[PDB]
Amino acid sequence: EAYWNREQEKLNRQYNPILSSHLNYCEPDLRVTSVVTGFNNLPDRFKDFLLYLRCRNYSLLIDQPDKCAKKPFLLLAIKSLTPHFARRQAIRESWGQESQTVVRVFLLGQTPPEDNHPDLSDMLKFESEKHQDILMWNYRDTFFNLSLKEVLFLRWVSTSCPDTEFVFKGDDDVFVNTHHILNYLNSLSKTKAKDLFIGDVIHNAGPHRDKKLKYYIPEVVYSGLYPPYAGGGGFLYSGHLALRLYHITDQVHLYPIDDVYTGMCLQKLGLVPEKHKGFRTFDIEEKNKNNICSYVDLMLVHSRKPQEMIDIWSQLQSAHLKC
Amino acid sequence: EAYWNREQEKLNRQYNSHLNYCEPDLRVTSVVTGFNNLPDRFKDFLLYLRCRNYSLLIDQPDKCAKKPFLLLAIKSLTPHFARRQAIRESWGQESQTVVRVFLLGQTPPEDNHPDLSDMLKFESEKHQDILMWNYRDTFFNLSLKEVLFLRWVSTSCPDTEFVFKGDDDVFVNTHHILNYLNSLSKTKAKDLFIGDVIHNAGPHRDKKLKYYIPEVVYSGLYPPYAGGGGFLYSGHLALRLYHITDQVHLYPIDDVYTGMCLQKLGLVPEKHKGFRTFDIEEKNKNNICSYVDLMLVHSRKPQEMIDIWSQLQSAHLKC
Numbered sequence: 001e002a003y004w005n006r007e008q009e010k011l012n013r014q015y016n017p018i019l020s021s022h023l024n025y026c027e028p029d030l031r032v033t034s035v036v037t038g039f040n041n042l043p044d045r046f047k048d049f050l051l052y053l054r055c056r057n058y059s060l061l062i063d064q065p066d067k068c069a070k071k072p073f074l075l076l077a078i079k080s081l082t083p084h085f086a087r088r089q090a091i092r093e094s095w096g097q098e099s100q101t102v103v104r105v106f107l108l109g110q111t112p113p114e115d116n117h118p119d120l121s122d123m124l125k126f127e128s129e130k131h132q133d134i135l136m137w138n139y140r141d142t143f144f145n146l147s148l149k150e151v152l153f154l155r156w157v158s159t160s161c162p163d164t165e166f167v168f169k170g171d172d173d174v175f176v177n178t179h180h181i182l183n184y185l186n187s188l189s190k191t192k193a194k195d196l197f198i199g200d201v202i203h204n205a206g207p208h209r210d211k212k213l214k215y216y217i218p219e220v221v222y223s224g225l226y227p228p229y230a231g232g233g234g235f236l237y238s239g240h241l242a243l244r245l246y247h248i249t250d251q252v253h254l255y256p257i258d259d260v261y262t263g264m265c266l267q268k269l270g271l272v273p274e275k276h277k278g279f280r281t282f283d284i285e286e287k288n289k290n291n292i293c294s295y296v297d298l299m300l301v302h303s304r305k306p307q308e309m310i311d312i313w314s315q316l317q318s319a320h321l322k323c
Numbered sequence: 324e325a326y327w328n329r330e331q332e333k334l335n336r337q338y339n340s341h342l343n344y345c346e347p348d349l350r351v352t353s354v355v356t357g358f359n360n361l362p363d364r365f366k367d368f369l370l371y372l373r374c375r376n377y378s379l380l381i382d383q384p385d386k387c388a389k390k391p392f393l394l395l396a397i398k399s400l401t402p403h404f405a406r407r408q409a410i411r412e413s414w415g416q417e418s419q420t421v422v423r424v425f426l427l428g429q430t431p432p433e434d435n436h437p438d439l440s441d442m443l444k445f446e447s448e449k450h451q452d453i454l455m456w457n458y459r460d461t462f463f464n465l466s467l468k469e470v471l472f473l474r475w476v477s478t479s480c481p482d483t484e485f486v487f488k489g490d491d492d493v494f495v496n497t498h499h500i501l502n503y504l505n506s507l508s509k510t511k512a513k514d515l516f517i518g519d520v521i522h523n524a525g526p527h528r529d530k531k532l533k534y535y536i537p538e539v540v541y542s543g544l545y546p547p548y549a550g551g552g553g554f555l556y557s558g559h560l561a562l563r564l565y566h567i568t569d570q571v572h573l574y575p576i577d578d579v580y581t582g583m584c585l586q587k588l589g590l591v592p593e594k595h596k597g598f599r600t601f602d603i604e605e606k607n608k609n610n611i612c613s614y615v616d617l618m619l620v621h622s623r624k625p626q627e628m629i630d631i632w633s634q635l636q637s638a639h640l641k642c
């Protein structure tokens with residue numbers, strides 16, 4: 001009934017013999033206009049999504065292929081948009097500092113002028129030259145194309161960083177305690193460090209049908225419920241699981257919600273994402289965030305301004321005293 | 324009883340070193356009842372109220388060589404590269420001459436801001452429209468941004484017929500601006516000050532509101548003042564405005580401060596139809612022709628500014 005479910009099951013047939021072009025088809029799949037009931041009255045983001053669902057062979061316009069010239073213990077992969085210079089620089093100065101080696105990339109798509117974005121291209125290459133932590137692909141960086149950002153990143157991992165022990169993918173408006181990250185990565189059996197995937201996992205969740213919510217998905221697009229999935233701003237996982245994640249992506253259609261898509265891929269691998277206390281997608285204790293020790297035990301809080309990130313990191317450096 | 328009113332009436336005595344006294348006025352900790360429980364922005368504002376002699380770190384003094392018809396002065400903060408660029412590309416295009424300045428203070432590292440200095444340098448060189456002074460660009464220091472701007476107008480752009488000062492997140496129909504500037508009797512082009520004037524307004528006493536002003540600090544009601552992200556006025560009135568700044572104590576709300584200067588010159592700000600401080604026809608903003616007659620709309624994102632300007636360019640053929 002729902003278009004995505006019907007297309008995914010068609011994909012399931014060709015990958016699963018016991019049930020007996022979606023990857024590089026980059027002209028509009030016009031059949032959607034006649035097969036999706038109500039196509040021309042959907043929001044534009046749904047139209048472009050359905051029209052170009054079967055295109056994912058996009059290329060890197062800016063790469064740092066040497067970012068992993070030393071087997072990293074932690075790859076920091078931060079989603080960002082072109083104009084977010086303040087968010088990126090505060091991460092660079094605070095928790096996203098490179099260092100058990102820690103390495104940092106920012107994952108960007110394109111904000112092109114035909115879509116009326118301001119031309120910030122020359123300041124980005126200037127930023128890319130100085131800091132050399134910018135990965136940009138040649139696809140339109142939009143809300144419903146974030147599954148592309150995830151698949152293209154996992155491809156980059158498998159091509160240019162397959163060694164990294166662990167990976168963190170997150171937003172550029174979240175504070176993460178990377179010191180307490182490296183400490184969690186070591187209360188870690190060499191067994192659990194194999195299939196690691198933790199975040200704020202949401203279960204039994206379903207698509208929102210309110211036309212005016214941001215995570216709205218109409219019934220002509222998706223039916224049923226969502227798999228378990230770690231949402232809310234960032235998750236942590238092992239590199240071994242990242243390589244397996246990339247190779248399964250070909251067997252799952254892109255979904256407009258990037259975190260739901262990552263859960264759909266994990267479930268296809270036979271995995272359940274592990275919830276964790278320290279993933280505070282909904283901020284910290286009753287507006288009492290001005291004590292630094294509440295940040296010493298968590299892994300990330302959402303959300304923080306650039307100024308806030310630097311100040312928290314600055315105070316965290318002395319928190320081994322005051323606590 | 325209110326600290327600002329008492330100090331201003333004291334100022335309303337000398338005119339019948341309140342501008343360069345840049346050490347912490349400790350007397351406010353004794354006279355302001357409840358000083359040490361006020362929010363930090365009030366403590367800082369009251370401590371340094373009599374300090375306003377700040378200097379330009381970045382200037383474009385050759386900006387006004389050619390007698391400009393309209394000076395576009397846009398308040399901005401250091402991290403707002405996208406907002407400024409979209410303005411450059413759209414309604415803030417230079418061109419009856421139009422010139423552009425962005426007005427910035429400092430977002431220094433001591434206050435935990437990211438270091439964006441080298442990119443602001445890179446940006447200033449390539450676009451030469453950044454005016455930066457050496458004061459902390461904070462909310463309650465915005466009256467400082469205005470006074471320092473008028474000082475720059477006096478020192479470096481005294482010729483310009485008219486000036487527009489506004490926020491970096493408003494859309495401004497510049498073509499329709501230059502059209503109000505024609506239905507202008509050469510009398511009105513002298514004392515012009517138009518905007519979304521608000522009368523009978525008063526301080527908000529709610530401690531959690533953003534324009535909250537406690538009783539210990541200000542009592543009474545505000546003068547008429549143009550608010551809401553932009554106003555338009557003549558250069559002749561700009562130079563008279565700067566000269567009177569020396570005779571009004573800075574106020575934590577910049578728009579209110581400009582009205583207090585207006586009233587002391589015996590002027591009432593001229594409310595105008597086209598200053599859409601609270602947007603347009605609830606949600607039917609999807610028609611370019613609602614933008615043909617207005618002067619500005621608050622608020623719009625960088626993408627929305629470029630896209631409206633782009634459609635406006637052919638709105639003479641379609642509305």
Ligand SMILES: *[C@@H]1O[C@H](CO)[C@@H](O[C@@H]2O[C@H](CO)[C@@H](O)[C@H](O)[C@H]2NC(C)=O)[C@H](O)[C@H]1NC(C)=O
Nearest residue numbers: 021023024025026027055056057058059138139
């Ligand atoms: C992804 O793969 C498709 C298919 O290989 C590419 O589409 C080609 O586009 C060129 C450009 O005009 C056409 O001449 C070819 O006919 C297309 N390919 C085929 C096999 O028909 C596409 O360019 C690739 N990359 C992207 C970013 O879409």
Ligand SMILES: *[C@@H]1O[C@H](CO)[C@@H](O[C@@H]2O[C@H](CO)[C@@H](O)[C@H](O)[C@H]2NC(C)=O)[C@H](O)[C@H]1NC(C)=O
Nearest residue numbers: 026027045048049052055138139140142144145
């Ligand atoms: C996801 O990104 C792709 C690539 O940037 C978008 O596809 C382009 O869409 C435009 C129309 O907006 C077409 O004219 C181009 O031919 C498409 N390019 C390719 C390579 O397919 C797509 O629209 C984006 N999807 C969403 C939902 O934003």
Ligand SMILES: *[C@@H]1O[C@H](CO)[C@@H](O[C@@H]2O[C@H](CO)[C@@H](O)[C@H](O)[C@H]2NC(C)=O)[C@H](O)[C@H]1NC(C)=O
Nearest residue numbers: 340342343344345346374375376377378457458
């Ligand atoms: C405003 O002007 C006063 C007076 O010129 C400045 O005060 C001087 O500051 C320097 C630098 O710290 C001192 O060495 C002098 O002794 C000060 N003189 C007096 C009379 O106090 C003040 O610094 C200026 N403010 C700003 C922001 O530039």
Ligand SMILES: *[C@@H]1O[C@H](CO)[C@@H](O[C@@H]2O[C@H](CO)[C@@H](O)[C@H](O)[C@H]2NC(C)=O)[C@H](O)[C@H]1NC(C)=O
Nearest residue numbers: 345346364367368371374457458459461463464
């Ligand atoms: C307005 O800007 C001035 C200048 O940046 C601020 O004054 C400084 O405040 C710091 C912190 O208290 C002092 O250490 C400096 O000595 C002050 N400098 C001068 C020249 O006075 C002032 O705090 C700002 N006001 C507000 C309300 O933010």
Ligand SMILES: C[C@H](NC(=O)c1ccc2[nH]c(=O)n([C@H](C)C(C)(C)C)c2c1)c1ccc(Br)cn1
Nearest residue numbers: 079080081141142143146149171172173213214
């Ligand atoms: C205006 C808003 N845009 C996004 O949400 C968006 C778009 C592209 C992005 N590329 C990317 O990396 N991110 C990350 C999440 C962050 C952390 C960098 C922000 C992106 C977010 C929106 C769009 C549609 C709807 Br409906 C409702 N709101």
Ligand SMILES: C[C@H](NC(=O)c1ccc2[nH]c(=O)n([C@H](C)C(C)(C)C)c2c1)c1ccc(Br)cn1
Nearest residue numbers: 398399400460461462465468490491492532533
């Ligand atoms: C976080 C927020 N900051 C501001 O509102 C602010 C500060 C300095 C500014 N310098 C300047 O030009 N602007 C223009 C208006 C714009 C158009 C650039 C935004 C400034 C705004 C805030 C909210 C509530 C409280 Br209480 C205190 N602060």
